Symmetry: D4
Subunit: 256 residues, 8 copies
């Protein structure tokens, strides 16, 4: 029976699906690189992680560049809505799509690397220790760092990201050539990972951090995912919003 | 001679042959560098070689025939109405011949290092195995159906992103810079999802080199190794590519 | 205060400040990654960080002021009659302020890691020296005049290639894609000729971080280490940049 | 001198000289970084240095003379009717001068490091050999004719891909972005097929540095190591480039 | 007063066997734990040295009171060949088992925090962070059950033949007062040259009581059901090996 | 002053001083080798140095005073009635003076190596800590009341085996060969049970070197590190040695 | 009865030589296999210790009945210098050869699974996974044949000189009952100091019978035609070396 | 030829031959271990060097212990003669025998390890550098070490050696059981090498140091063997004599 295409032809359904697909592709590539690094030694490195995340963002921008802007980031959506560039009524649709895409990407990565995870871990799913595999999906605070240092790191990283994102795609200034923005955005993400990544895991995206943590909690890693490192789970959800807003307002006041 | 060489079908066959040969030579050379030597090889080098060989192939034969260089991509394009069905045999034959000759060339250029490394013994399995240079073999901890799932999913992602990059109505790459983006896509497919199966997401990349290793003196264990794994990289990518293409067409397109 | 912010000189000052801040933050972050951690850092990472920080700075402020981000490049442009001499102080002051604040930011973000690595003692030289994150110091086998030669030659190469990339009469990079090429140029300058002096081919990259380390508790040995090396990165790049520019203008132009 | 400076032949000679110098400085610097140091050197760095040095040279002199930077490429172009035979000696002479001066510059910059690494003794073969920074020497297991085959095939692949990139009738790279694609081509040539012979696929990159090392105190063993290996990099690339060019012209063109 | 009980002969022999086995097992298990847990503070040669020269101290402690067997297989071989009465087998074996159990408990007590830090809280028999192998011996990846049986039997036979040879007065013996060094060197080289196939648990007292302790102390019942029920081979093979080695030496050389 | 040297008490004092000096010099030399140098140092070297230094001390002063070289051993022997209580102060004083002078000797002999390794800074804790050559400090995961138990048990084992080796009624070592067996006992004590606390089971081995480090410039952090660890390896060995001796006397003796 | 023939002097001398050679070769080949196959359980010092201190156990087994030569070169040197009658040479050599052959067989049977796992199922004499060097000695890459001849001769000469020195009653000898440890230490330091050039096969019995076993067991005839027919140097060089070393000691120090 | 065989029956010739042979054996074993360490990575270690140089002394003591005491050391002979234990008329013969034995041992080690030396070096014989091989036969000063520090090290090490040698073989005191002294002397030398032997190479023997240096000068390593490290060659010949004499005096006065 036809006529279901009427629903799939609305103006908000298309943007919801675009956000879903772009976030799914980006997260699959990024989490795959992270799993490569964690599990194997001859098939993984940090530069591989950076390349995977950055040039997954590139492919996401290609997938959903024109339909919805390819935010792929809840902090970016909040910053754009709060500066008047996007109406406030599009926030829930984008956030829901990004969260569903990230959750399903985590499930995909879990299914693809199952045997390797079991062989590496010894059969026990641990959040901490020498055989911890909960770091593949979410980000946990390092040994020497404290909570507020991580808050500062997340805020500053997201501010830098938003400043450069505004600078690249501004047509009244010196922008990237139309049709070549995806490469430059991927390079920006790669070098954010390269330069400022060891302190917190640079989970500068709430969608990159929370839905995978919920998946790891459900799939059998325990309740220690939320209470590890003095309840670290809420820093990557709050710090990026403030960072992105401050970076955007700085660029608009000074350079724009 | 020039009269026959001017046929359009002959031109398309030659274009597919040359592009596939270039891509396979670069990829197999990188894999041989990694396996044989230690200070001259890395996994990142393998990814780079197999990724930008695709860019060079696209530059070689991107206009004459579209530069598929992949049986799964050709099957997906034909099954979705983009290419006539009558062009499947010629494209697949050209790709297979190019891959076979590239495998022979890599065997000829690296012969001394292969013999020096292996001790003179051509072994499919063991600490000095050299048959994995040309084809892909299942790792220690993997089963057959896990490998099937990996191959299908990786090919689906490749086809979805290929449709996204070269779509003129949607947000495409700038005409004249698409080869770079396709190469980067293949590079990150290798970087992110390649340890489980060797990402043999190409039937043309996997079968003809295996037949060459059977002929050249690696024995008949190339086919019976890993619970008869030889047929998975020939069947899974077709299904994966078809599903990825249909998903992109229905949802985004 | 909107009227003052709309002035031309204020806009140029702010543009140079922001671009230099971005470039220095990325570069110093990569250097700190390399120095402190073992599995998260490499020389290639340092090269990539500095080069693509230059790229992002060019995108930020490449049209308001030219995105020099370099005192040697500004001096070379002014002395060859391309920029008025009256705009040298404003650009230099903006670059110095940006570099100082970038050093402060890198100090604040990596504080715990620095203390954990060193053990609480801030040492200019030794096996746990951390003063090399911010400025460049003479290696063990080098002398002072060899370092002078290295600095001058590297800055000359940089200036010649920079003139070549943006020359409209000659073969230039496609407008809108120049930032990538400049980033790649800086990346390969780091890769090819970087181990002899740390390629502090920018006076603004070298002096303000050194002043910050002097202020912040690394002591007065920052200026007196290596037989008063602090002035070579400030003097050699100006001569190198001028010679490279005049060579390009006479020969290729 | 103006009257003896704006002539077309002098301009083309200067363009070739500058481009060859620029590319060779970066390539030899990366090779020296790899040989002398362990933490600051890698094979990927060598590949990147050579490829993007080619990119910068193409930017410097890509419109004045075509930026051949290669004696084999010039020979292939002249033999196919694209470039007149009267511009062969000037291009080759400029390339040789540029390569010789680039080798001299690299010797001057890395002098202290070379003396520290070798212990003071300049030797061609052994565990502390340093003559391989400038030229290419046959590795342990290989023989002469396998190396001849390697050089010929590598140069053929290079010439075929160079023809494909810049062909306007076929699918070319977008004008303004060809330098990046040529650099990536050289990078993957190094990554995939570079350990068997050192991929000195250039008569201008291999011989002038060898003559410099002979003059500068490395002895006459540079010309008699590995059964007079010196002449193979001079002769094999010409044949390889010619065959690759005609193959592309007949089949794809 | 209980001085009458402590001045007997069987009580003295029981105490001597207990003390010698305790002294040997503490050193052996400490060396094994050093090897397994830390990297720069452990080596296979250190394991061999500890397990070999703990026997020297055991022989010094209980050499004259009871012969310092410290081994159930050696006791069985001596009783079967007519050198020890059959009524001394139970007391010797009981003392050796108690000493080995207490030595395992001591090594667990002294290395508690290091074990928890290495494993990461949990206690696993198998895996990359397994620590159950500090106390007992588990079969390697390649070996099968009967190959391990053959290894245990042959190693114990060699041990018994050399032990008979060293301490035989008619033949060429070691100088009295210097036999402990030679026996320690014998055990050291047995570990060095034949010790990787099974773990050279050629002593039932060295193998079973630590396994029982690990089962009780929270390692679970996988200690008994790992490697196709490997637990019974180190109890049955050494007896046959020791008897064969002794009879061969007596028939041929003696 | 030849008469004063003939008195029995002075003879015993000098014997204890000399034997302790020899033992401590060998032990601290081995420990410094392990810490400062990488290829010349190992844990087995430390064990050998301490054990066979004990052997050499026994040979030096085994007859004049019994060759205790250990305050816990002296306390256990006096308490059980084998040595009069009037000889405890002189033995302890000689041992302490010998240990202090051996620490001074090792400090003088390895001075340049210590300065080169530490960078010139004497640090109790950190990646370049050198205070652990002279005394023992609590490890990473250990606590105080686990180290107490470790020290007591190790000293108990030492004393029990020492009683067993030198008992004439039981099975002793052949007279004239006891030093070898005592040295091997100390070697295996180090090998088997030494990593939890540094097996400093001796007041004389631990306190005087720590006092020397405090005086010589390591500061007051030697006494207050690890929750005031300085007193555990002075009170635990006494209890351990007493218990081990009484257990041997009651059960085996 | 098989008890009257077994009591003849020339029969028990044969049995003593057979047993001592078997023990020594078992220990030595076990250590070599440990080094070759596994990386974390093997070292060069372990090889030295195993080979050196198997000699101690052999001496204790058969040091008084026959002299415990365990070496064809030592027997030849003793016979040629008049210390031993020439009629005992064949029986001693036969016993040593049988013992070495059976020790090679035992080492093959105990390490079978490990050998197959390491080599990949292919028995190879040359290559990165060559396992024929566990049993015999093969010429290194840069050495030539006559340099190996010189090395074998000189090492055997040093061994024989020091062996004469240790056991000379008129000179300064080792204390009786302690003469096995000193011989073991001599062999250990011969391995430690001069063993990397040729594998220090200073014993024809240590070299030829294991090579014959490897030829039979499936390593092929490349065991004999490797390194320009190197198999005969370790059989001929030690005899001359031992004779010269003994003569030097007798003339100068004796 | 019995006319010349009467020469080999005199006491002085007997002692000369005993010293020659014992020094030869010791130096062969020690230099072989050092060459093993320097040339090869897997077949060499510092502990092997210590063991070889330590138990060569045991073998030499067994060879020539009754005839002359097996000094094998010029400092030991000087200390024994100066303190009144050996007549001064027997000093030159012992020293000459030790020097000849050490020279021939160096020649033997050079002949045995010739191909390995040439393969390691690359054909070039260098006193200093990353492929230096002159240090197999003699000792050279380290990088951070000075000259007077080396003098102090040599003196102290030889003093400890002499004190322990007096202690081990003292009949009135606690001696090693006769027939078992060689093992204890070997262990003494082993732990002297283990504990204190990295600052100077512990060339506590002039006979171990000078004749191999003369051989390396003659055999083609050049004249830099003497002028390397500010003329270091004379320290190992002067420091051990003073050290040994002081150690002997201290033992005889305080313990003896």
């Amino acid at each position: 029976i036809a006529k279901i295409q009427e629903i799939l032809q609305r103006k908000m359904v298309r943007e919801f699906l675009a956000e879903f697909m772009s976030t799914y592709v980006m997260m699959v590539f990024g989490l795959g690189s992270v799993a490569h690094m964690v599990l194997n030694k001859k098939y993984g490195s940090y530069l591989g992680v950076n390349l995977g995340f950055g040039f997954g963002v590139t492919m996401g921008v290609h997938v959903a560049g024109r339909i919805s802007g390819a935010h792929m980031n809840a902090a970016v959506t909040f910053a754009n809505c709060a500066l008047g560039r996007v109406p406030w009524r599009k926030f829930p649709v984008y956030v829901l799509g990004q969260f569903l895409g990230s959750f399903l990407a985590a499930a995909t990565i879990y299914s693809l690397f199952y045997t390797a995870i079991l062989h590496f871990s010894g059969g026990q799913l641990m959040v901490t220790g020498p055989v911890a595999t909960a770091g593949i999906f979410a980000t946990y605070l390092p040994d020497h760092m404290t909570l507020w240092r991580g808050f500062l790191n997340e805020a500053w990283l997201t501010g830098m990201l938003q400043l450069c994102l505004f600078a690249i795609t501004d047509q009244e200034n010196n922008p990237a050539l139309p049709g070549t923005e995806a490469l430059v955005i991927g390079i920006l993400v790669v070098i954010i990972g390269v330069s400022l990544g060891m302190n917190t895991g640079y989970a500068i995206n709430p969608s990159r951090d929370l839905p995978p943590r919920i998946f790891t909690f459900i799939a059998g890693w325990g309740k220690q995912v939320f209470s590890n490192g003095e309840n670290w789970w809420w820093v990557p959800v709050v710090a990026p919003l403030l960072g992105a807003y401050l970076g955007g307002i700085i660029y608009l006041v000074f350079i724009g």
